[PDB]
């Protein structure tokens, strides 16, 4: 009998994991689906629960120790630009729910997975994205504990519903991944994000946070990217598995185009606003980095890796870039108009910001810079002015309509990007469509989208009353969560909103 010290390795356990399954008739995917992946499917990463736990625990402590010692010793929580403080506030608030619906959709995948190895990969995905949720929540917690504006992080979950961008983020990550069919959910929840959005989004957030001067986010986001690489590998493997299916060649390209368009339509303007208009120190124009990350280093490699299996690149990218060239600015105008609804505090671009925008974006001045200038000179920041940008927009004939499919705020008269307003009548209810693809999607599947526009939600409701009943007031009970100015002086009060007297008119009802 041998007595040499022998240490077992996870390789054999993973090898037997494939044979762990046993076959019988009644076993089936619980959820509706039209695709069935191959019963056998290899995974790039040989991962067991124990090895995964060790790998995650090492980096998790590492990052918690870093944040709990170095960041609090340097006092870097307070040494951040408040604009970027609000920007990271909204970023963390949105990404936490994004990753939560990510674990939900990955659980759907694991339910609709036949291969045991693929099931283990999906379980690792679920646990990794649970980690991501908790890390985002912990970033919010540390910002609340140390950063000088706690209010936005304290009531992040409760006051999230009031904002208009929240519906769009819900549609892209929350309901964008769980509502589809299981295969489709995979690409939207995984490939569409991991490749075209999450991979780049992270590096950009780290770089911009380093530029502005907050070291709390980078560490967490890099730790997230570590698992996101495994997510990419799992995506590629599961797309390989879903190939060779006769139905795959009939619907996979359509699902890919659907997911890509649905994700980009709101993703592009959202980041564009949160980066260009949410920071004082900008490293590089957002149009160039968006184009690069979404197309040059995504389409080439992924079509190289997938077209061998019969995958066609979406042709919506030619319209997507034309939209993206001004969609972030359009959403910027919409958000600056609807600031009282949102939780984050915002600052109008300054003269250096205006000249930066004009130098990087030709024609930005004559379209947006004056609009911001007359907004500033009409007592935008001043609480005693009692000026509401939405009231000015209504008085000027420019009225905002959100899409029914993507729920993105959209101004038809004040947008230079492509896309047009479409109003539809169906069984006594009017519907607003902003894009041809969205119009087609709503037309084919009216039962798919029933999201209630906030305009009829707040119809007959005064804005200050909506804020008060939505817990949009500060802890003191006299001031709003959001402010027109990044400065910590002359904070707006709910009585100022009452004096303004903005009333929602149902713009779509017209």
């Amino acid at each position: 009998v041998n007595r040499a010290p022998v240490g077992v390795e996870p390789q054999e356990v993973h090898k037997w994991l494939q044979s762990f399954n046993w076959d019988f008739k009644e076993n089936r995917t619980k959820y509706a689906t039209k695709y069935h992946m191959a019963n056998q499917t290899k995974e790039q990463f040989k991962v067991i629960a124990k090895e995964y736990a060790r790998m995650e625990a090492a980096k998790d402590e590492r990052q918690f120790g870093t944040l709990l010692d170095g960041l609090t010793r340097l006092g870097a929580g307070n040494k951040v630009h408040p604009r970027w403080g609000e920007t990271m506030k909204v970023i963390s608030n949105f990404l936490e729910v994004g990753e939560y619906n990510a674990i939900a959709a990955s659980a759907m995948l694991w339910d609709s997975a036949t291969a045991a190895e693929q099931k283990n990969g999906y379980l690792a995905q679920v646990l990794d994205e649970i980690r991501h949720t908790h890390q985002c929540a912990f970033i919010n917690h540390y910002y609340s504990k140390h950063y000088h504006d706690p209010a936005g992080h304290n009531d992040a979950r409760r006051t999230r519903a009031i904002g208009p961008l929240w519906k769009g983020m819900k549609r892209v990550f929350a309901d964008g991944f769980i509502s589809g069919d299981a295969v489709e959910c995979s690409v939207n929840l995984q490939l569409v994000g991991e490749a075209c959005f999450t991979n780049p989004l992270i590096v950009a957030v780290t770089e911009w946070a380093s530029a502005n001067g907050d070291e709390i986010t980078p560490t967490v986001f890099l730790s997230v990217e570590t698992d996101e690489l495994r997510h990419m590998a799992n995506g590629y493997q599961t797309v390989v598995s879903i190939a060779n299916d006769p139905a795959a060649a009939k619907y996979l390209n359509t699902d890919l185009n659907n997911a890509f368009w649905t994700q980009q339509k709101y993703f592009t303007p959202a980041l564009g606003y949160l980066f260009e208009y949410g920071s004082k120190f900008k490293v590089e124009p957002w149009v160039k980095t968006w184009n690069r990350w979404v197309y040059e280093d995504w389409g080439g490699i992924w079509i190289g890796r997938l077209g061998k299996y019969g995958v066609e690149s979406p042709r919506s990218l030619r319209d997507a870039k034309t939209d993206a060239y001004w969609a972030h600015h359009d959403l910027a105008l919409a958000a600056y108009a609807l600031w009282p609804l949102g939780f984050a505090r915002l600052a109008l671009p300054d003269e250096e910001d205006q000249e930066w925008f004009e130098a990087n974006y030709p024609g930005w001045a004559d379209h947006y810079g004056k609009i911001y200038n007359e907004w500033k000179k009409l007592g935008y920041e001043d609480p005693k002015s009692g000026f509401i940008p939405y009231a000015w927009l209504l008085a000027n004939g420019h009225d905002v309509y959100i899409d029914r499919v993507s729920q993105v705020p959209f101004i038809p008269s004040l947008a230079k990007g492509s896309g047009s307003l479409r109003v539809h009548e169906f069984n006594g209810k009017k519907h607003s469509l902003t894009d041809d693809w969205g119009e087609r999607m709503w037309l084919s599947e009216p039962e798919r989208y029933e999201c209630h526009n906030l305009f009829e939600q707040y119809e007959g409701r005064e804005l200050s009353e909506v804020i008060a009943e939505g817990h949009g007031v500060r802890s003191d009970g006299k001031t709003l969560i959001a402010q027109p100015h990044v400065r910590g002086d002359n904070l707006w009060t709910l009585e100022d909103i009452k004096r303004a007297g903005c009333v929602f008119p149902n713009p779509l009802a017209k």
Binding site: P5, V6, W16, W22, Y100, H134
Partner: protein, 385 residues
């Protein structure tokens, strides 16, 4: 390539821009969350309210219908998935305050300690004093069958994850599923290590597969697990059946009584480690699940009995299923060679009485299920020869 904090002029601009006074008095994260304990726990501080629920979902902060439902009229996260109803879905709090970080820490602990102790055991060569018959027949053939039961429960939790109407509940369910799958991995790894030490041992899963499929001993367990997978869509029903009743009857009896006591009294010392790991995992899962059901559903001030009547029916059906599975399984006791104490009928009846009594006092008294252990244990023992 310049950091905002390190750069001199950038840091000066940041320090000039930052306000001198804090804007909000309270730094507490999510103060509005009602804490189950005296103080808002950090686990509650993060995990709770992470789920965006519209107002038409119980305890929903958000408003408005789902922005993108399933194809057809069914909502993405509607309350039709569950059959039980509660005043609020966020009332559940894990008794261990176990969010992702402590759970993964403890799981890496289990990995590291298992590897170290396993290498030490290999160095000492204590395996040679084990009973030849025990490790040759019982573990290799039937201990690999419980592997498939644990894997079946694990893949079973695939739905609860997606159809969970809360966030702490989803985290607890995912952790329980991870416990099931890594218990399966522990069984497989123990078999591999035993094969590594003694030559001629069969590490292949073909024999456990044959035992799990074509052997009448585990037919009841296989049927119960298969009915658990796709028989019921309701995630509350899946959690209850696969955690309280069927688990704490069949899997608890198996692991705690047979594969632990008979392992000990047969000179085995490697198996008790893995049995203890599985027992700890089950203890944590059982605590979480009983806290869920008893605190939220079994004692809901409004839904009250409605939620219970349903638990009573599920408990009756799955208790009958688990009793049949145990009666079919008990034949392994006649399969193994006779030993005084555990193996003989009196010890078996006493073990069954202990298992059913603890299960009753843990679940049935709180839920209201009326069970007398005598007829149960007699029905299970009737299959013993």
């Amino acid at each position: 390539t310049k950091r905002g904090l390190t750069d001199p002029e950038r840091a000066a601009i940041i320090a000039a821009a930052v306000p001198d006074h804090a804007l909000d008095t309270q730094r507490k994260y999510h103060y509005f969350i009602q804490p189950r304990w005296k103080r808002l726990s950090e686990y509650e501080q993060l995990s709770c309210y992470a789920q965006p629920n519209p107002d038409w979902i119980a305890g929903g902060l958000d408003w408005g219908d789902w922005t993108q439902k399933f194809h057809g009229g069914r909502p993405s996260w509607g309350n039709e998935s569950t059959e039980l109803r509660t005043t609020d879905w966020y009332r559940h709090r894990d008794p261990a305050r176990r969010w992702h970080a402590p759970y993964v820490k403890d799981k890496s602990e289990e990995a590291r300690y298992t590897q170290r102790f396993l290498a030490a055991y290999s160095s000492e060569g204590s395996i040679r004093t084990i009973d030849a018959y025990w490790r040759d027949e019982i573990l290799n053939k039937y201990y690999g069958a419980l592997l498939y039961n644990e894997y079946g429960l694990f893949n079973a939790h695939s739905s609860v994850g997606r159809d969970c109407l809360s966030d702490t509940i989803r985290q607890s369910a995912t952790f329980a599923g991870l416990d099931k799958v890594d218990n399966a991995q522990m069984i497989q790894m123990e078999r591999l290590f035993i094969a590594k030490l003694v030559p001629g041992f069969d590490a292949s899963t073909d024999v456990p597969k044959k035992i799990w499929t074509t052997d009448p001993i585990y037919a009841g367990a296989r049927g119960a697990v298969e009915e658990i997978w796709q028989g019921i869509q309701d995630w509350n029903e899946i959690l209850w059946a696969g955690h309280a009743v069927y688990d704490a009857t069949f899997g608890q009896f198996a692991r705690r009584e047979f594969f632990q006591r008979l392992a000990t009294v047969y000179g085995d010392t490697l198996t008790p480690f893995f049995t203890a790991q599985s027992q700890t995992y089950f203890q944590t899962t059982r605590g979480a699940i009983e806290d869920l059901f008893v605190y939220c559903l079994a004692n809901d001030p409004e839904f009250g009995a409605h939620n219970r009547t349903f638990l009573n029916a599920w408990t009756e059906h799955y208790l009958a299923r688990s009793v049949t599975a145990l009666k079919d399984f008990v034949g392994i006791y006649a399969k193994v060679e006779k030993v005084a104490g555990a193996t003989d009928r009196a010890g078996v009846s006493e073990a069954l009485q202990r298992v059913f009594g603890d299960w009753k006092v843990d679940y049935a008294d709180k839920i209201g299920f009326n069970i007398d252990v005598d007829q149960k244990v007699d029905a299970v023992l009737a299959g013993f020869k």
